[PDB]
């Protein structure tokens, strides 16, 4: 910031192979990585989950790789996502949700495992339960119609060498189309 | 406007 600018820490749309994000507990209905398309019609890695019929009360977790924070005291996280209208999903029931919750946890090295940091608030720091202003609709026989949602969250103040972001779903039906972490330098 | 995959858990809802 001898020249002032925003500096990227992570941009999923630039991943050319697979993201390798870690999921838990890896049961039926788990988060799945899928190839999607961005605004330039280029292939990008995305994550989807839609466990609304079988077990809408089962939590499904998704964790990023470890992100070294460099000088950053606050980091911004821009999330772009589709959220299905519960009423469009056949045999979704009363338990279906139209939100997901975003957490982070700071660590001094990339020490996470399949089971740790423990998959729960504390250690994870709850940032926001994110609502969707735009619901995607699908009517029998027809193409889905909808808009993409965007939410930017501010994380910090940060003090350890790096951090993980984690997403908790429980009975929602959504596609995480992109994550971009950046800070002001 | 890409919203979700033809091959994922969302598509499987129908």
Contact A122, A46 (CB under 8 A): no
**Cβ of residue A173 closer than 8 Å to a chain B Cβ:** yes
What domains are there in chain A, each with its CATH number? 1-185 (2.60.120.260)
Distance, in Å, from the CA atom of A111 to the CA atom of A95, rounded to the nearest integer, reads: 35
Distance, in Å, from the CA atom of B12 to the CA atom of A52, rounded to the nearest integer, reads: 11
Distance, in Å, from the CA atom of A162 to the CA atom of B3, rounded to the nearest integer, reads: 31
Contact A157, A74 (CB under 8 A): yes
Q: Report how this structure was experimentally obtained.
A: X-ray
CB contact under 8 A, A32 and B9: yes
Contact A54, A14 (CB under 8 A): no
By Cβ distance, the residue of B1, B2, B5 closest to A48 is B5
Please tell me whether residue A50 adopts helix, strand or coil conformation: strand
Strand ranges in A19-124 using DSSP code E only, listed in sequence order: 22-24, 32-37, 43-50, 59-63, 67-68, 75-84, 99-107
């Amino acid at each position: 910031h001898h020249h002032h600018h925003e500096e990227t820490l992570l941009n999923t749309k630039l991943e050319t192979a697979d993201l390798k994000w870690v999921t838990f507990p890896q049961v039926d209905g788990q988060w799945e990585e899928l190839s999607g398309l961005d605004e330039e019609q280029h292939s990008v890695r995305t994550y989807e989950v839609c466990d609304v019929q079988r077990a809408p009360g089962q939590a499904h977790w998704l964790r990023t790789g470890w992100v070294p924070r460099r000088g950053a005291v606050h980091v911004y996280a821009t999330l772009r996502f589709t959220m299905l209208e519960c009423l469009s999903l056949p045999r979704a029931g009363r338990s279906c949700k139209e939100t997901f919750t975003v957490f982070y946890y700071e660590s001094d090295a990339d020490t996470a495992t399949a089971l740790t940091p423990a998959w729960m608030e504390n250690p994870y720091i709850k940032v926001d339960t994110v609502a969707a202003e735009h619901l995607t609709r699908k009517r029998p026989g027809a193409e889905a119609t909808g808009k993409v949602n965007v939410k930017t969250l501010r994380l910090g103040p940060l003090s350890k060498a790096g951090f993980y972001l984690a997403f908790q779903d429980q009975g929602a039906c959504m596609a995480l189309l992109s994550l971009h972490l950046f800070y002001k330098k | 406007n890409y919203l979700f995959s033809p091959n994922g858990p969302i598509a499987r809802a129908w």
